Design a protein around this nucleic acid. Structure first.
Lengths: 102, 67, 233, 118
RNA sequence: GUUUUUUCACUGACCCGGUGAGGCGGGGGGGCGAGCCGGGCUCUCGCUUCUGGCGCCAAGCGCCCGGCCGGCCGGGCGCGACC
């Protein structure tokens, strides 16, 4: 017989995800010395809508501890997070909403 | 001659010395590419028996295939 | 004397305070594949149980005997390509109007003369890249009663001859003024290599964990031993 | 020397230049796009005669591989006249037509008389 | 006495994740608390939380050498940034 519709989805090329207007892979900040032994502080710049996703994203800006650069990450926005809020990261970070820690 | 000793040495592949050497060499060649140039013959007496002469223009390539 | 405009400006290199200084990071370099491969090949010889016939090459002649051995071997170097031609000239003007003793090189020559009782001392390099070339030769020297020694460097053994590397070098015959100097070496080499071959054949190598993995078990056994050291009183 | 970065880069080695022991070809090739081969013939048509008379230009059929610069410096050598500008087109015949405007002090029809078109 | 198999572990074959493979493991140095009477030890941390700011390309100290008349001028090394 003919190859069925659920079988045809694994080949791709029609059933692939529509990722043209998506803002990027939403993920946590990568673990380093600061987030492993202390905390690092960043700022929520804006909260954007990611297409094909009910959750909003937050663009959080940190500063690199080794280079004079500003690093941009896309977190998934906890409810209650506003812009201008400082988001802390690491083992010694306090326990508040929007504050990642182990 | 040393070549007769190396020849009878390679016939004891189940011995401790040869099972150490074969395992570490298999690990080393597994970390390289699928085809690359060896700088010299690994097994010189057998290369010599098969027709390798250690002079200019004789090239040795080491290669792996899937079983 | 001092200028009041010369301030002292310290940098607080804490977490999140200042940008870190450009520190030494040789441990955390992503090394190339050949460097990484040879470095963790050097660790596998410490981890895996090395059989004694390969482990015996790690047991080596020490720092002061090697200099005496090479000092003796410098008097019996083979001729270069220049003295080879000069001897052919000297033979020609000898014809117009005895072999000196030299060093003998090559594992195929050394094995044959050890079998034929011609060698008086054998020097074997410790870093032969296929170890099958000389892994049988300490046993062949010990059974035929020929004194053998193991030396740091096929390169340094390859400087006695005028080549890149040499694997084994045999003293077969020496001069009469250097016979005593050779016999001085032969006694010390025989009491270290040929006499202790029963213990050489039983000494497995490697089987050593890493420092990070032995500190972890040392702390654990320290806790388990201090339990007994403190709960008894 | 310390490793400041955790990335190993390939060190820049010395690169020598080509010093061949023999040239691969014995002689340089002759420039086949010569000043005579680049300009084939002019047009004597009534559409080109008005172009010569009124606009002080000359109309040539040139080689198809020719730039405007090459056409300019080719007219300046064969006919000893400088050029205001060169406008080229490619005909449906396949040939390249060149309108070559002369300087205001040179007169195109008095150039055309000595070359033959009239 | 060979060998069968069950469990507890190890890493080094093999697998996964992260990263621009950036501070990993032990040790040393400094600070806060329990306690013994200035000294060795159990412990911990080593510096950032009121704010939609800024933060790199060394300050400082020590050691040398180099040209011009202890004084002009300009370099390198170590600590700073523990082994």
């Amino acid at each position: 017989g003919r190859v069925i519709r659920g079988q045809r989805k694994g080949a791709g090329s029609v059933f692939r995800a529509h990722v043209k207007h998506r803002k990027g892979a939403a993920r946590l900040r990568a673990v380093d010395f600061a987030e492993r032994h202390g905390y690092i502080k960043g700022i929520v710049k804006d909260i954007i809508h990611d297409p094909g996703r009910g959750a909003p994203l937050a663009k959080v800006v940190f500063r690199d501890p080794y280079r004079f650069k500003k690093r941009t990450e896309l977190f998934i926005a906890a409810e209650g997070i506003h812009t201008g809020q400082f988001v802390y990261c690491g083992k010694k970070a306090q326990l508040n909403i929007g504050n990642v820690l182990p | 001659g040393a070549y007769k000793y190396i020849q009878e040495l390679w016939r004891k592949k189940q011995s401790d010395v040869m099972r150490f050497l074969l395992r570490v060499r298999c690990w080393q060649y597994r970390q390289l590419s699928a085809l690359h140039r060896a700088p010299r013959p690994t097994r010189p007496d057998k290369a010599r028996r098969l027709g390798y002469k250690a002079k200019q223009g004789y090239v040795i390539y080491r290669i792996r295939v899937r079983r | 004397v001092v200028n009041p405009l010369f301030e002292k400006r310290p940098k607080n290199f804490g977490i999140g305070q200042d940008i870190q200084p450009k520190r030494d990071l040789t441990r955390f370099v992503k090394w190339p594949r050949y460097i990484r491969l040879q470095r963790q090949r050097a660790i596998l010889y410490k981890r895996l149980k090395v059989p004694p016939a390969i482990n015996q090459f790690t047991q080596v002649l020490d720092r002061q005997t090697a200099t005496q051995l090479l000092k003796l071997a410098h008097k019996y170097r083979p001729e270069t390509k220049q003295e080879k031609k000069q001897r052919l000239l000297a033979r020609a003007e000898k014809k117009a109007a005895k072999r000196p003793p030299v060093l003998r090189a090559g594992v195929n020559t050394v094995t044959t003369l050890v079998e034929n009782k011609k060698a008086q001392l054998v020097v074997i390099a410790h870093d032969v890249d296929p170890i099958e070339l000389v892994v049988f030769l300490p046993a062949l020297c010990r059974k035929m009663g020929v004194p053998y020694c193991i030396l740091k460097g096929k390169a340094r053994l390859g400087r006695l001859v005028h080549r890149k590397t040499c694997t084994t070098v045999a003293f077969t015959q020496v001069n009469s003024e250097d016979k005593g100097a050779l016999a001085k070496l032969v006694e010390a080499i025989r009491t270290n290599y040929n006499d202790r071959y029963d213990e050489i054949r039983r000494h497995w190598g490697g089987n050593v964990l890493g420092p990070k993995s032995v500190a972890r078990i040392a702390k654990l056994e320290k806790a388990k031993a201090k339990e007994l050291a403190t709960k008894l009183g | 020397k310390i490793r400041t970065s955790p990335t190993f880069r390939r060190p820049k080695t010395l690169r020598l230049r080509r010093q061949p022991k023999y040239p691969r070809k014995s002689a340089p090739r002759r420039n086949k796009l010569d000043h005579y081969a680049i300009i084939k013939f002019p047009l004597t048509t009534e559409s080109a005669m008005k172009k010569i008379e009124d606009n002080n230009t000359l109309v040539f059929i040139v080689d198809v591989k020719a730039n405007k610069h090459q056409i300019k410096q080719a007219v300046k050598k064969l006919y000893d006249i400088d050029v205001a500008k060169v406008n080229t087109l490619i005909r449906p015949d396949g040939e390249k037509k060149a309108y070559v405007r002369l300087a205001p002090d040179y007169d195109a029809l008095d150039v055309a008389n000595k070359i033959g078109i009239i």
